Design a protein around this ligand. Structure first.
Ligand SMILES: C[C@@H]1CN(c2cc(-c3n[nH]c4ccc(OC5(C)CC5)cc34)ncn2)C[C@H](C)O1
Ligand SMILES: Nc1nc2c(ncn2[C@@H]2O[C@H](COP(=O)(O)OP(=O)(O)O)[C@@H](O)[C@H]2O)c(=O)[nH]1
Ligand SMILES: [Mg+2]
Length: 906
């Protein structure tokens, strides 16, 4: 019986006095318990075009923007007019009171659970500054919580803004009267944070999310709702008809919150309107913005006096560019936030044949019709009246020379089905290209959106444009030499090597990072939209992103409309009620990486079992167990991170690219052991010691002898038998006590000569391992320094310090050594770090961090590299691909090569 009453109207009308029978939304209670929200001069309109819900009854008190917001938020809701989908219209007392009760009772018919306990708990809890965090103990004391909180929010008990692009999900506003008085008392109109602070970290963030206090600079807040109600005297550098371009936007009324929204949109993009980054001059009068880069490049967006919106730009190249980008941004803003004007909106293009005569206007649709069969207006080119219809504002190097195009559009020339078009195989300028054709009932808006994406962003991981036209309305971009990723996943499963699919993932992550850095949300990532140019893993370009027909500007305000293919979209996008940030793209990339790791897998199952693919996406199986793929540790972890319900828990695209940009990720191949099971030695199925295990001082695989050291059959205690602790063959050598010894006793190299260099304690220590190579690498107990000696001279050659490398990049004390045939040295420090040194140049290739807490024993098997470590107790067994140093070098070189391309494509 909890009904919501919202008395909306124009200030003064005496609607507050109407109920009794100015500083923000009020609230009262009436007995059928009625929750009344009494709304309130005109500054609050852009502050609360939000608090309408759906389960409420409206009482309008001839303002039409109010009705426009009502019919756009709560479509099915009674609206009773009172004098001083309309259901009744009364005039002014008690007779209308019965109508309200009758309408409220009929509204429930025209339009229970464990709620009532959480409702009471949230209502009966008083705190100062009432908003509270995720206080789960209040429900613990007394998969269904976000389904009850939503109902309570839609009932007036509290407000929970769970929209991803608000960052207010964690905190819960109690007794929502307070949030309608502290958020609406901040309001010539350029006040600073210092003054606000004298009346707060989340408070400033909360204000800007509601279009109340925009950030125009440090310690500065724009506060659009408080700007002057009249424009100053602007005298533009050009006043002749032939020198300016004018376009009007005629509306029945300005939507509630339209101008603050437009100002926010325009001031965020102004640095990048010419280049795509120099700041212009800006002015504000609450119904317009003046941008000014020069007397030749400016932009005046205002509102003449119904409800027209004028855009004035100079009639030059930079003026046309600014006009095009302002029109595109206004159209995008209207599509995102004001659906209902798209017809309630009329667009006029102003033109004149001779200078000095009155301006006459033509409807933009008629002008587009005339431009579809010509580029001149017959009683004065169209490029001077509406340059954006013929793409005259875009760069001239991407204009379609229709005489150089050999395009068939045959069913056998099809390449794929785009978002709103169809890509075909064609030839342009004597080259193999791909042409996208929009299907019959499309407008210039889709072309212009995909051109916004394709024209100003150049990245080695984004599809490149070659030409664009309007008469056939195509997009010639380029031909991917190897097709889409879906075809590779479902047909050519054999060519997908590990190092190739890692590059495929990395190139898509890099493209997403760049797309997000330019305030663009892709909104649909799938193997179909990922294009492959080569299957050679060492190439710089392996994967690109195409089909930008669903991409849209995603500024700090977010995006509301829902786009994306079922099964490749974030969970917050499937339920098209919240407004989401660019983390949906991160979730889509997580799904795509899951697909890459599992190859066909869930895609093959979804083409077999539809309408369950999208339902399973809120939990999906383990990649390894479900489809039997080879384990890819630290990539399954990234998949789990990217496949999280909370968008804020998900990493950003830059973080995903950073995680993927590591050779530890690709060369890792990690097996944990039971808790409190310590391992001393292992041999290669793998045999382990402790008690002899399988998956005691020494072991050996004799083609299993169990013991200080043992080789497949020499035994060392320090009495050797065909304290001694070292023996290796590469000739066979060894080490006894604190001196190196050899035999084919052949060469007793007593090693206390090195006491002069380094500490004597490190010099005179028991030997741990000896390595046989052109040189002699020796490390001792608790020795952060590895000694290098020459067999030919039986003399020291030089000492290397692991502590030096560790500090340059941490126990540092050497525990084990292993030599790789590619001239790389593996050293296991006392901590959980691994050092890769080139044997020749003595240079640090890379240090392995976050691996473990301590390294015990290290060896190689078959070709992989076995490292055993502790976690001080828990011991872990880790398998590293033995191509790790070369992979580090190749990955860093590849990153540099394709990074010097991103700064050259611009
Ligand atoms: C196998 C065959 C298939 N092929 C392609 C090419 C493409 C392609 N190229 N360029 C494009 C630009 C855009 C584009 O928009 C998509 C993603 C909407 C389909 C596709 C392509 N997409 C699939 N297959 C190229 C030939 C050589 O190989
Ligand atoms: N005498 C009289 N005063 C009215 C009438 N309607 C409105 N008012 C005046 O309008 C004021 C109410 O303003 P109100 O509409 O509640 O402001 P709002 O809540 O911010 O929209 C009261 O002070 C009344 O004096 C009316 O029919 N008769
Ligand atoms: Mg009032």
């Amino acid at each position: 019986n909890r009904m919501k009453l919202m008395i909306v109207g124009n200030t003064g009308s005496g609607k507050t006095t109407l109920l009794q029978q100015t500083v923000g939304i009020d609230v009262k209670d009436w007995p059928l318990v009625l929750n009344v929200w009494d709304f309130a001069r005109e500054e609050f309109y852009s502050t609360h075009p939000h608090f309408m819900t759906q389960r409420a009854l409206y009482l309008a008190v001839a303002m039409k923007p109010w009705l426009f917001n009502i019919k756009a938020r709560a479509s099915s809701s009674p609206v009773i007019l009172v004098g001083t989908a309309i259901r009744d219209y009364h005039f002014v007392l008690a007779k209308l009171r019965k109508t309200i009760i009758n309408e409220s009772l009929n509204f429930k018919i025209r339009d229970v659970e464990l709620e009532k306990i959480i409702l009471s708990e949230r209502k009966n809890v008083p705190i100062e500054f009432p908003v509270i965090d995720r206080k789960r103990l209040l429900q613990l004391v007394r998969n269904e919580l976000p389904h009850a909180v939503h109902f309570l929010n839609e009932s007036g008990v509290l407000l929970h803004f769970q929209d991803p692009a608000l960052q207010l999900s964690d905190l819960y506003f109690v007794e929502p009267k307070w949030l309608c008085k502290i958020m609406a008392q901040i309001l010539k109109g350029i006040i600073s944070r210092r003054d606000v602070e004298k009346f707060m970290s989340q408070y400033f963030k909360l204000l800007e999310k509601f279009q109340i206090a925009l950030p125009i600079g440090e310690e500065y807040l724009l506060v659009p709702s408080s700007l002057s109600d009249h424009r100053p005297v602007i005298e533009l550098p050009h006043c002749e008809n032939s020198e300016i371009i004018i376009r009007l936007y005629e509306m029945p009324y300005f939507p509630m919150g339209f101008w603050s929204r437009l100002i926010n949109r325009l001031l965020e993009i102004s640095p990048y309107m010419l280049s795509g980054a120099l700041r212009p001059n800006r002015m504000y009068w609450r119904q317009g913005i003046y941008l000014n880069w020069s007397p030749e490049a400016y932009c005046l967006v205002g509102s003449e006096v119904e409800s027209f919106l004028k855009i004035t730009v100079p009639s030059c190249r930079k003026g046309c560019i600014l006009l095009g980008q302002v029109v595109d941004h206004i159209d995008s803003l209207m599509e995102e936030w004001f659906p209902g004007l798209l017809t309630l909106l009329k667009k006029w293009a102003l033109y004149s044949f001779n200078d000095g005569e009155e301006h006459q206007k033509i409807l933009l649709d008629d002008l587009m019709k005339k431009a579809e069969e010509g580029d001149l207006l017959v009683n004065i080119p169209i490029s001077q009246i509406a340059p954006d219809l013929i793409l005259a504002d875009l760069p001239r190097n991407i204009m379609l020379n229709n005489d150089e195009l050999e395009f068939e559009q045959a069913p056998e020339f099809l390449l794929g089905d785009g978002s709103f078009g169809s890509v075909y195989r064609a030839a342009y300028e004597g080259e193999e290209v791909a042409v996208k054709i929009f299907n019959k009932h499309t407008s210039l808006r889709l072309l212009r959106q995909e051109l916004v994406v394709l024209c100003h962003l150049h990245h080695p991981s984004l599809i490149s444009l070659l030409a664009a036209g309007i008469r056939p309305r195509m997009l010639v971009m380029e031909l991917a030499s190897k097709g889409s990723l879906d075809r590779l996943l479902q047909q050519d499963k054999a060519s997908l090597t590990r190092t190739l699919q890692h590059r495929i993932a990395l190139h898509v992550a890099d493209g997403l990072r760049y797309l997000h850095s330019a305030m663009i949300i892709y909104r649909d990532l799938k193997p179909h939209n990922v294009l492959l140019f080569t299957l050679y893993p060492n190439a710089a370009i392996i994967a690109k992103i195409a089909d930008y027909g669903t991409a849209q500007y995603c500024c700090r305000m977010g995006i509301k409309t829902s786009e994306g293919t079922p099964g490749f979209r974030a969970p917050e996008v499937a339920r098209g009620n919240v407004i989401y940030n660019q983390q949906a793209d991160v979730y889509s990339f997580g799904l795509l990486l899951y697909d890459i790791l599992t190859t066909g897998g869930r895609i093959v199952e979804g083409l077999k079992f539809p309408n369950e693919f999208d339902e399973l996406e809120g939990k999906l199986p383990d990649p390894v167990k479900e489809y039997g793929c080879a384990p890819w540790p630290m990539v399954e972890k990234l998949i789990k991170q990217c496949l999280k319900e909370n968008p804020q828990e998900r990493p950003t695209s830059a973080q995903v690219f950073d995680i993927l940009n590591s050779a530890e990720l690709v060369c890792l191949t990690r097996i944990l052991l039971p808790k409190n099971v310590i391992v001393e030695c292992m041999v290669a199925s793998i045999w382990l010691g402790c008690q002899l295990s399988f998956l005691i001082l020494c072991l050996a695989l004799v083609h299993i002898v169990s013991g200080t050291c043992l080789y497949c059959l020499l035994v060392g205690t320090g009495k050797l038998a065909i304290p001694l602790m070292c023996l290796s063959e590469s000739v066979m050598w060894g080490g006894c006590g604190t001196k190196i010894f050899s035999f084919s006793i052949q060469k007793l190299i007593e090693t206390r000569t090195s006491q002069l260099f380094s500490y004597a304690a490190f010099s005179d220590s028991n030997i741990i391992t000896v390595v046989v190579d052109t040189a002699l690498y020796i490390a001792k107990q608790n020795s952060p320094v590895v000694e290098v000696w020459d067999k030919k001279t039986e003399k020291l050659c030089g000492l290397i310090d692991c502590v030096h490398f560790l500090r340059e990049v941490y126990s540092g004390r050497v525990k084990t050594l292993c030599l790789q045939k590619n001239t790389a040295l593996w050293i296991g420090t006392g901590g959980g770090h691994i050092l890769l040194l080139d044997l020749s140049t003595r240079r640090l290739i890379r240090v392995i961090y976050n691996f473990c807490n301590s390294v015990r024993v290290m060896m190689t098997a078959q070709n992989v590299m076995l490292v055993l470590g502790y976690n001080r107790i828990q011991s872990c067994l880790t398998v590293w691909d033995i191509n790790l140093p070369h992979e580090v070098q190749n990955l860093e070189k590849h990153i540099e090569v394709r990074k010097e391309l991103a700064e050259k494509m611009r």
